[PDB]
Amino acid sequence: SVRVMQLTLGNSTITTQEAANSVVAYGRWPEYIKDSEANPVDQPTEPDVAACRFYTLDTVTWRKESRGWWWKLPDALKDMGLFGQNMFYHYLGRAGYTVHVQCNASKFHQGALGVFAVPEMCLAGDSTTHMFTKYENANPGEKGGEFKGSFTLDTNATNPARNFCPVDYLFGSGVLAGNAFVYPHQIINLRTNNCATLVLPYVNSLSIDSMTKHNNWGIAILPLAPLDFATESSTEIPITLTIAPMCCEFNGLRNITVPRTQ
Amino acid sequence: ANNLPDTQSSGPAHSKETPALTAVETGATNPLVPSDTVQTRHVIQKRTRSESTVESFFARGACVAIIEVDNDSKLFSVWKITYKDTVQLRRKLEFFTYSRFDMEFTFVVTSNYTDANNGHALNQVYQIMYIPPGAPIPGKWNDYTWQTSSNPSVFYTYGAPPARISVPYVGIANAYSHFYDGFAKVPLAGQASTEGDSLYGAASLNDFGSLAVRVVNDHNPTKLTSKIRVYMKPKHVRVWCPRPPRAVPYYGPGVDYKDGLAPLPGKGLTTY
Numbered sequence: 188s189v190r191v192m193q194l195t196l197g198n199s200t201i202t203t204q205e206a207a208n209s210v211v212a213y214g215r216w217p218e219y220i221k222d223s224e225a226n227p228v229d230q231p232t233e234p235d236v237a238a239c240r241f242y243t244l245d246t247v248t249w250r251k252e253s254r255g256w257w258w259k260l261p262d263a264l265k266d267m268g269l270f271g272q273n274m275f276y277h278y279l280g281r282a283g284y285t286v287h288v289q290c291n292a293s294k295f296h297q298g299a300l301g302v303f304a305v306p307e308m309c310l311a312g313d314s315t316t317h318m319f320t321k322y323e324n325a326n327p328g329e330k331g332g333e334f335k336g337s338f339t340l341d342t343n344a345t346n347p348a349r350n351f352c353p354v355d356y357l358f359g360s361g362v363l364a365g366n367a368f369v370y371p372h373q374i375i376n377l378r379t380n381n382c383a384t385l386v387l388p389y390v391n392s393l394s395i396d397s398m399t400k401h402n403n404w405g406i407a408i409l410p411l412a413p414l415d416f417a418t419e420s421s422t423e424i425p426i427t428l429t430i431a432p433m434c435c436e437f438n439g440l441r442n443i444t445v446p447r448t449q
Numbered sequence: 450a451n452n453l454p455d456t457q458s459s460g461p462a463h464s465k466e467t468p469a470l471t472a473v474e475t476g477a478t479n480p481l482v483p484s485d486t487v488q489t490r491h492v493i494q495k496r497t498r499s500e501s502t503v504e505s506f507f508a509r510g511a512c513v514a515i516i517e518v519d520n521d522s523k524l525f526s527v528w529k530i531t532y533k534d535t536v537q538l539r540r541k542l543e544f545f546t547y548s549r550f551d552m553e554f555t556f557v558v559t560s561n562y563t564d565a566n567n568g569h570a571l572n573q574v575y576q577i578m579y580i581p582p583g584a585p586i587p588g589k590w591n592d593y594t595w596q597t598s599s600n601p602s603v604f605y606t607y608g609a610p611p612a613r614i615s616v617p618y619v620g621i622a623n624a625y626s627h628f629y630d631g632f633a634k635v636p637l638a639g640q641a642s643t644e645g646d647s648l649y650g651a652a653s654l655n656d657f658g659s660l661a662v663r664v665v666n667d668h669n670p671t672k673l674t675s676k677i678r679v680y681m682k683p684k685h686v687r688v689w690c691p692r693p694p695r696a697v698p699y700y701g702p703g704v705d706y707k708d709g710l711a712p713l714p715g716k717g718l719t720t721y
């Protein structure tokens with residue numbers, strides 16, 4: 188039925204008994220580069236089962252006060268097994284994804300989470316200096332980031348944070364959040380479903396790019412209807428994020444990249 | 450101006466054929482492609498060399514002269530036709546030894562009052578007369594030579610779109626020579642040193658003649674100056690014998706050099 192599914196990729200399987208169908212972004216399933224759209228001339232590496240499998244990133248907790256969370260792809264998976272290895276050993280890389288967000292509660296809980304997949308999800312910074320966010324802050328990895336309820340300008344001139352300041356109702360980029368529904372999405376309304384499943388093809392203005400310099404997709408999760416339970420002002424339910432890269436192919440092998448951190 | 454070949458997929462090799470090894474002493478360049486030294490994938494090539502054709506490389510109007518006339522002998526000026534008065538077009542032409550093409554000349558004319566608060570003049574008309582080598586050159590801005598009964602003239606009205614005319618291949622040889630390793634005279638044994646001496650690399654003393662420019666209106670005591678910028682574009686181009694481009698500053702009409710003889714910067718041998 189629309190509600191029961193099983194996803195198998197490599198050596199990993201995911202089962203769900205409360206789905207609300209699955210979304211295939213823009214109606215496009217991920218695919219490899221065709222010869223007619225090929226650019227780099229060298230033989231690509233395609234790890235296949237070693238990289239195209241389900242990786243579970245860290246679990247976040249939803250509370251009445253949560254504003255939202257965000258992650259960047261392939262960034263969030265840079266340290267994930269052999270996918271991360273191939274990402275750092277190659278100059279160029281390409282991949283699609285199957286994003287599976289998990290969140291179960293009970294029949295006496297309420298709340299709705301909007302799960303959006305955004306191509307080129309550029310976020311707003313914290314200073315008066317334009318495009319000032321530094322690489323280390325823009326790429327948090329598997330832990331991702333969070334949305335805020337208001338904009339707060341960083342004034343420390345001696346030691347600028349050079350970080351993002353994504354305000355939730357402004358979708359972290361100066362647009363109204365209610366219009367974010369034009370992007371592939373699903374809603375995890377506690378009275379209806381457990382999860383959200385989105386299949387994302389590779390989207391870019393090029394056939395292949397640098398995975399370290401460029402993040403193709405952004406995953407934004409916003410509480411559309413806040414978490415509430417029985418009478419417990421105190422309520423916490425975890426949100427686990429499991430993502431699997433698809434049709435990975437890398438070009439331009441050399442020595443490994445070791446990016447600067449923190 | 451066409452397509453480039455596709456990249457064919459290439460796998461591993463273990464053979465007695467070694468395209469990587471060669472011997473440049475022969476004077477030939479090794480025609481290798483990526484698949485000769487690495488494993489390649491099949492790529493359908495869609496890039497073309499449409500913009501690097503000899504025609505597209507020269508298909509631009511380049512400035513070759515700025516003729517100036519002061520409508521208050523300066524009432525008229527004469528410019529000896531050449532492409533060596535400027536450096537940009539000259540350097541591009543000199544990638545080749547010989548050339549053959551037609552020419553398109555566009556004239557951009559500007560004028561202005563020298564005085565911010567003095568004088569006035571009615572709209573000016575200019576006459577650009579071509580004086581082929583041999584024809585009488587004007588001595589005054591208004592002598593008989595300006596009747597142009599045979600010389601081609603162009604009358605330009607100030608403010609009108611730039612004037613433009615086409616000239617056929619006018620060389621007396623089968624192609625224009627960008628380089629001429631010789632003289633116009635051979636000094637003979639016995640003659641005075643003053644005799645038989647000529648410039649090295651020069652052909653005719655007057656190759657293509659010159660342009661005589663003047664303002665046709667009667668000059669008013671007002672101080673005015675006009676400038677005619679000449680733009681030339683080679684069209685229907687054919688070129689022969691490539692040469693390395695000019696690396697140091699030009700020093701005259703010849704290949705002479707003097708000043709910027711150290712064009713390259715310093716860089717460590719093992720510095721990326």
Ligand SMILES: COc1ccc(OCc2ccc(COc3c(Cl)cccc3Cl)cc2)c(Cl)c1
Pocket residue numbers: 513530531532542548552554577578579601602603614616619625626627657660681
């Ligand atoms: C190798 O590169 C070359 C070769 C020959 C060249 O000049 C030959 C040449 C001969 C006659 C005329 C005369 O053209 C004109 C006429 Cl009819 C009427 C009005 C104005 C002009 Cl302008 C103009 C140029 C140049 Cl500029 C570059």
